[PDB]
Each structure stands twice: as C-alpha cells, then as structure tokens.
Design a binder for this molecule. Structure first.
Ligand code: MYA
Ligand code: XMQ
Length: 391
C-alpha cells in the first residue's frame, strides 16, 4: 500500500477552524495536575459506555498520565475544547507519536485516542471538527498518517477483532450484568468452572525489571515482526509502556518475564493493564476491575511449531490469569489479535459482544486478518495480522 495523499506543508493553516459558538480551542497541559483532573472529570462522565449504559470506562489519572505522555509526546496533540465563559472542558481528542510497520513499510504515525464529547454537545457534528483540528496540528509537525481503533464500524477498517473475557470473580460479574448464566447451567457450576490454580507454573516467571528492557525489546520486536500490522517499539517505548515506576500513584501496567532457570536468558514475557469501569446505577456495586492483555512474546514462536507455541501460551496466559486474580481483578480481557486464538477458548475466555475495529488515516493497505472467521469466532488461520494493541 502507501499514502493516499501528500500534504503540502505550505498550505497547512496556521490557525484552527471555527468552532460552535460559545466554544474555543484549548491545548491541554496534562503536566498540570488541575488540567489532568479536568480531562478525568470529562472522561469519567462522558467517555465510552456499553450499549445498555451499565458501564463506562474510568481511566484513572495515573493511566491518563501514562497513556498520553509517552515518548515523543507533545502537549499540542492534547486538544481540548472549552466553553468560552465558564472555561469548562467539554471535548477532547488526543494523539501520541509512534512508529508502526504496515506490511514491512515503517511509518511515523500518531495514535489517536480519548475522543470525547460531553453528552450535552453530542450529534452536533463536532467530531469532524475535532478530527480536522488534531489533523492540522499533526501536519504542522510533519506527521501525515494515523492509526486508531474504535468499537464502532466506520469507513474502510483495516481489521476487526472480537473481545474475549475470562471471569476472575464470576459471581461479581454475574451480579453486575457483565457475565450471563448459560442456559442449562447454575451459578455453582460457573464458579467451579472459573477456578484457577493458587500458584503460577512457568519456571522462572518473575516481574519485569528495568535491567530486562533491552532483552524484552529485542524479543518483542522479533515476535511483533510476525504480524502484518505491528507497533515498532523503541527502547524508550519499552521502558515507558512495560515498566511500572512505583515512585505512578496507582499501578497501571503489570509486566512479567520468564528468566530461563538454566541459561538465565529471558525467553518469554507478558503484560496486562488496569482499566476499571464505573458500574452505573447499581446500588450494590460501583466498579468492574478489568485487566487487559497487552503485549507479550515468546522464543517458542520462532520454531513455527504451532502446537509448541499453543502449549507455551496456554501455560504463560494461565499464569497471567492467576496473577491478575491475585492482584484482585474481577475479569481478564483479551482480543483475537496476536496469537490469541491459540489459547482464548481453551483458557475459558467467553466471547464478548464488543468488537475493536482498526483504522489507518491517509494510508491504504489490503485488509489484515483479525483472528476471527466469517462467524466472528476465533480462527488459527486468520492470525499473523494484527500485532498492535491500543488502550
Ligand atoms: C495525520 C493525523 C490524523 C489524525 C486524525 C486521524 C483520524 C482520527 C479519528 C478519531 C478516532 C478516535 C478514536 C477513539 O477515541 S474511539 C472512542 C471514541 N469515544 C467515545 O465513544 C466516547 C463516547 N462518545 C462520544 O463522546 C461521542 O459519541 C463521539 C465523540 C464518539 C462522537 O460524537 P457524536 O456522536 O456527537 O457525533 P458527531 O455528530 O460529533 O459526529 C458524527 C460523525 O462522527 C463520526 N464518528 C462517530 N464516532 C466516531 C469515532 N469513535 N471515531 C471516529 N469518528 C466517529 C460519525 O460516523 C459521523 O461521521 P460522518 O457523518 O462524517 O461519516
Ligand atoms: C465493562 C465495560 N465497560 N465498558 C465501558 C464497556 C463497553 C464494557 N463492556 S466490555 O465487554 O468489557 C467491552 C465492550 Cl462491550 C466494547 C468495547 C469496545 C470499546 C472500544 N474502546 C476501547 C479502546 N479505545 C481505544 C476505543 C474505545 C470494549 C469493551 Cl472492554
């Protein structure tokens, strides 16, 4: 594939477009505590819900700091819209830079996320305006392509992946309306079915440390290179995205490595992050604590023995579940991307209603497989496609 259009630097406007009357553009500075708080206030009450308005994402302030001030970040790519009078933040749209590989052409992109409009301003076509404005700011900085994901179908997705959910506290999930009771089953059977071992099995599993950064970087890059569409990690990005710094307020990222008991080389790693959802108007529960499978890698993949890879992943990911369960998560979420179809059904992940659609701006490439077939069920012959995860 390649770029759709070339942008003329000479022609990029130095001024933003008009906004709806009574509103103005505002660059957010998320190193200001009070500004990070305003973003959090906006997302907490207006960001992504399920269709039934039972749950809303509640990215924490630590999470917002981590996701939005990643290497190369610029405050210019954190775009707010404020009410002119009250100064209230009523919309946002954000970018951070990264590099991605699209069938072996590397591209400098922004990843767009945290598009949000206050409920009272919805269905006024402010979205195109937000998009066009962040687009202008990216073009002024020499960035002309983007990748983004959404839970909704929009023109020309590059891929689509299904959400899967492994219950950790099945009864809590039942009570909030997250997890159904299967037709002929009972709650006891579901509780029994979701039990997990009390201890991990992979020899040499331990938390990731800073000293592991270069090795993990090498291993993740080799492994991600197996996917048509992947994120091309830098060392700083591995540092930022994979290593928790206990000095955030509230841990966001959990990373574990496998140090081979004999060679002491790291041969595997996996990571998962913390994203809670507000439970809406339920007097007995206000929260679902989800862990999401993030990046991982294993040397076993380079053998191209799909059976040995499966085996290894069943072991590593069951350990990920045990760990998430010890860390008090209520559910573990994963998508059908990476080599995830190899283990999802076997580790008792249930199929979700949600889908994650992947999109590129200003770049054309052939559709990429998303780990599912025509029935939207996991498919080991439709992997090797999506090797990027967005937050
Ligand atoms: C070179 C750099 C380029 C950088 C830019 C790259 C592109 C980045 C793209 C942004 C990627 C963001 C990634 C994420 O953050 S995905 C998460 C998005 N956030 C939410 O779902 C939060 C809850 N919902 C809302 O806040 C509002 O409903 C939003 C803001 C989503 C739309 O507000 P509203 O409901 O009031 O609608 P409107 O009247 O203003 O506008 C209607 C138009 O907007 C199109 N639409 C609706 N939803 C989305 C969506 N999720 N991505 C892209 N476009 C979307 C829609 O098809 C229609 O298009 P069209 O009629 O023109 O065909
Ligand atoms: C528990 C829950 N909270 N929220 C807010 C939602 C939608 C749920 N249900 S769910 O099954 O976990 C689910 C469902 Cl139904 C649907 C989706 C698609 C959401 C896509 N978002 C997540 C990533 N972001 C970059 C784009 C917006 C994600 C999830 Cl995580």
């Amino acid at each position: 594939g390649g770029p759709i259009k070339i942008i003329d630097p000479e022609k990029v406007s130095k001024e933003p477009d008009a906004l709806l009357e009574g509103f103005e553009w505002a660059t957010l500075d998320l190193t200001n505590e009070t500004e990070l708080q305003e973003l959090w206030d906006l997302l907490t009450y207006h960001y992504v819900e399920d269709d039934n308005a039972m749950f809303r994402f509640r990215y924490s302030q630590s999470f917002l700091h981590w996701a939005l001030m990643s290497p190369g970040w610029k405050k210019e790519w954190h775009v707010g819209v404020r009410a002119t009078k009250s100064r209230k933040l009523v919309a946002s749209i954000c970018g951070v830079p990264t590099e991605i590989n699209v069938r072996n052409q590397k591209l400098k992109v922004v990843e767009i996320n945290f598009l949000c409009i206050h409920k009272k301003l919805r269905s006024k076509r402010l979205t195109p305006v937000l998009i066009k404005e962040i687009t202008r700011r990216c073009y002024l900085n020499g960035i002309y392509q983007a990748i983004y994901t959404a839970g909704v179908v929009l023109p020309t997705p590059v891929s689509s992946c299904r959400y899967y959910h492994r219950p950790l506290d099945w009864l809590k999930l039942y009570e909030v309306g997250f997890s159904p009771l299967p037709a002929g089953s009972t709650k006891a059977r579901q509780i029994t079915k979701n039990h997990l071992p009390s201890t991990t099995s992979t020899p040499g599993l331990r938390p990731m440390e800073p000293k592991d950064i270069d090795t993990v970087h090498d291993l993740l890059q080799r492994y991600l290179s197996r996917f048509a569409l992947n994120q091309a990690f830098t060392r700083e990005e591995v540092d930022h995205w994979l290593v928790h710094k206990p000095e955030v307020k509230e841990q966001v990222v959990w990373a574990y490595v496998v140090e081979d008991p004999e060679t002491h080389k790291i041969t595997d790693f996996f990571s998962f992050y913390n994203l809670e959802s507000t439970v809406i108007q339920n007097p007995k529960h206000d929260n679902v604590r989800a862990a999401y499978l993030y990046y991982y890698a294993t040397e076993t993949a380079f053998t191209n023995n799909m059976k040995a890879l499966k085996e290894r992943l069943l072991m590593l990911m069951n350990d990920a579940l045990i760990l998430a369960k010890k860390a008090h998560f209520d559910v573990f979420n994963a998508l059908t991307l990476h080599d995830n179809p190899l283990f999802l059904e076997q580790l008792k992940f249930g199929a979700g209603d949600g889908q994650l659609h992947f999109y590129l701006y200003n770049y054309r490439t052939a559709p990429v497989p998303g780990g599912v077939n025509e029935k939207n069920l996991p498919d080991e012959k439709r992997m090797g496609g999506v090797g990027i995860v967005m937050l």
